[PDB]
Design a protein around this nucleic acid. Structure first.
Ligand SMILES: OC[C@H]1O[C@@](CO)(O[C@H]2O[C@H](CO)[C@@H](O)[C@H](O)[C@H]2O)[C@@H](O)[C@@H]1O
Ligand code: MG
Length: 580
DNA sequence: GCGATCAGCC
DNA sequence: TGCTGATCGCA
């Protein structure tokens, strides 16, 4: 059963062919400045295992790694590329990434190792990483004999699976999606992660001290209002204090007990002064724990930078996700938490942060895909879409739109993109189902094309078994035929929402690729730092701001051509906060 | 370790 | 709608 391979003590020309499956193993989940525990190469000449200290010190091997004409097939090439960047070695020529290929074929499979991808094609001559390295506290690198065979088997699977995967991608019309979008983007993300974002730790440490003070006061007041001390962070102990000791009314329960969600507490605020304080405590504690302490734990002491990892093969819609830290959910709505962004600064003096965001890209994409005359005209006039929606559903002139009307029209617009549901809208606007239903019916009378799209996309999902995005990303929806109402309904909302959210993801990804190419052409020092779904954040010399003010929006607005214009807003300043 | 709870943004 | 991650409780 064992697989044959050469456990080489030195590198040979034989292992430097112009096409090969390459494995540069980094076991640590977070690959930044992490160890490369072994290398495996499989090509027309055979299978090889090389110790990293050997291969990575070899002039020939390193040159081969950096030679773009020498093609390599891999799994999660970004992980290897970044781990190599930290060692001052460039990886080029990656023409096929099995992780990205598997992700495009079916993001629902949750493929996270070679074994999982291989199983898609009935190939099982490779073990899952978890079985070899174990998990959690017991996750360790095995002895060389066990390690070497694993890396060789992974490289062998990659070598064998490339053709089958590329063939199915072609049939799905996703070959260009992999080769011209996801793979090139992978290299850009590697550069962004490696560059990192400079953090002002002193500023963070100072904010944390202020929060600590406020939490102290609010915490004491809470015990004062409750007549005793208890763990506020335990819904269990809070529930007894609120719904038992204070006799507050139970407006919602949870599988385990009483509900203490912010939405429920605000409705209880009028009854007791403790509720307001609990809410405030919830706010402060969130910033302190998740952002201040959480951010300070991942900043690198030597450079004062945070190096996030963009998971490119996780979301079911095509969006990127960010971890350690998640720089895609830094506070912005509330001012107190928004100030956390003052902590993100340029990596060099005399440099500034430049941020550009698409204005209502999802609604614009919807206007385009549904070809709704009213909605397309609205964006062609660059109207305030929420005010316009309010005018139509409530049948009033612009002057007649009140702040509450706009707020509700705004909530309807969000529902429409998420896959409208009279139940979900009702809960959100704190109104009845029938009323939420009335709003929805009114919306469809105003936007018949959108109604048509919603009906047709659900039908299509049932017919083909999946829905697609502008650049041909795909999402299978087997639950679309379920006889269970809740399960089937979720699938229907997914059918309505994916072409919208997914197409928006396709566009920003293409914009990143086009932008990176333009910056190089223009010889600008400016570079991408982060992406947050509908916005791109860069940093550059202060002398490049004027050129970026024209270049970035143009590149982003021209990424794709839709039936409606794409609009990009932009700002720049000394910190991320000031890039407003 | 792992669920159920909560809350941050898109 | 799509995410990450915190603290708690239990195991
Ligand atoms: O290298 C990122 C890439 O690896 C996967 C597993 O194949 O995720 C691993 O690394 C992430 C970043 O450290 C972790 O969040 C995740 O828990 C770990 O399994 C892929 O999902 C990802 O695309
Ligand atoms: Mg925006």
């Amino acid at each position: 059963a064992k697989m044959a391979f050469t456990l080489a003590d030195r590198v040979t020309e034989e292992m430097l062919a112009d096409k090969a499956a390459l494995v540069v193993e980094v076991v640590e989940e977070n690959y930044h400045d992490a160890p490369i525990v072994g290398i495996a190469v499989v090509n027309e000449h055979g299978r090889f295992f090389l110790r990293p200290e050997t291969a990575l010190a070899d002039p020939q091997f390193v040159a081969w790694l950096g030679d773009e004409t020498k093609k390599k097939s891999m799994f999660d090439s970004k992980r290897a590329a970044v781990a190599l960047k930290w060692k001052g070695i460039e990886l080029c020529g990656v023409s096929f990434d099995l992780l990205l290929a598997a992700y495009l074929l079916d993001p629902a499979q949750g493929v996270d190792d070679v074994a999982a991808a291989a199983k898609m094609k009935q190939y099982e001559a490779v073990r899952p990483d978890e079985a070899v390295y174990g998990k959690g506290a017991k996750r360790a690198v095995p002895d060389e004999p066990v390690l070497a065979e694993h890396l060789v088997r992974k490289a062998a699977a990659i070598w064998e699976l490339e053709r089958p995967f590329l063939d199915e991608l072609r049939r799905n019309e996703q070959d260009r999606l992999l080769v011209e979008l996801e793979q090139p983007l992978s290299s850009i993300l590697a550069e962004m992660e490696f560059a990192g974002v400079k953090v002002d730790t002193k500023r963070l440490e100072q904010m944390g001290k202020e929060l600590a003070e406020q939490l102290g006061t609010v915490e004491q007041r809470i015990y004062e209002l409750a007549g005793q001390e208890f763990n506020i962070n335990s819904p269990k102990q809070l529930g007894v204090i609120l719904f038992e000791k204070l006799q507050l009314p139970v407006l919602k329960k949870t599988k385990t007990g009483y509900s203490t969600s912010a939405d429920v507490l605000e409705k209880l605020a009028p009854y007791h002064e403790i509720v307001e304080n609990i809410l405030h405590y919830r706010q402060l504690g969130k910033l302190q724990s998740t952002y201040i302490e959480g951010l300070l734990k991942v900043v690198r002491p030597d450079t004062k930078k945070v190096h996030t990892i963009f998971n490119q093969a996780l979301t079911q819609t095509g969006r990127l996700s960010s971890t350690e830290p998640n720089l895609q959910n830094i506070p912005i709505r509330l001012e107190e938490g928004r100030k956390i962004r003052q902590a993100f600064v340029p990596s060099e003096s005399d440099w500034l942060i430049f941020a550009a965001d698409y204005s209502q890209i999802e609604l614009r994409v919807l206007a385009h895909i549904a070809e709704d005359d009213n909605l397309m005209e609205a964006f062609r006039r660059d109207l305030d879409i929420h005010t316009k929606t309010a005018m139509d559903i409530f049948q009033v002139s612009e002057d007649e739109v009140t702040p509450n009307m706009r707020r509700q029209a705004k909530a309807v617009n969000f529902g429409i993109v998420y896959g409208i549901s009279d139940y979900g809208l009702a809960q959100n606007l704190n109104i009845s189902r029938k009323e939420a239903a009335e709003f929805i019916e009114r919306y469809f009378e105003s936007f018949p094309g959108v109604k048509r799209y919603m009906e047709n996309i659900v039908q299509e999902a049932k017919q083909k078994g999946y829905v697609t995005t502008l650049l041909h990303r795909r999402r299978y929806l087997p639950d679309i035929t379920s006889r269970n109402f809740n399960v089937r309904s979720f699938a229907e909302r997914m059918a309505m929402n994916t072409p919208i959210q997914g197409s928006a993801a396709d566009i920003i990804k293409k914009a990143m690729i086009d932008l990176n190419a333009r910056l190089k052409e223009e010889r600008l020092q400016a570079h991408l730092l982060l992406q947050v779904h509908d916005e791109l954040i860069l940093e550059a010399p202060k002398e490049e701001m004027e050129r970026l003010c024209r270049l970035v929006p143009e590149v982003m607005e021209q990424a794709v051509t839709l039936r409606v214009p794409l609009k990009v807003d932009y700002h720049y300043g000394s910190t991320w906060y000031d890039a407003k």
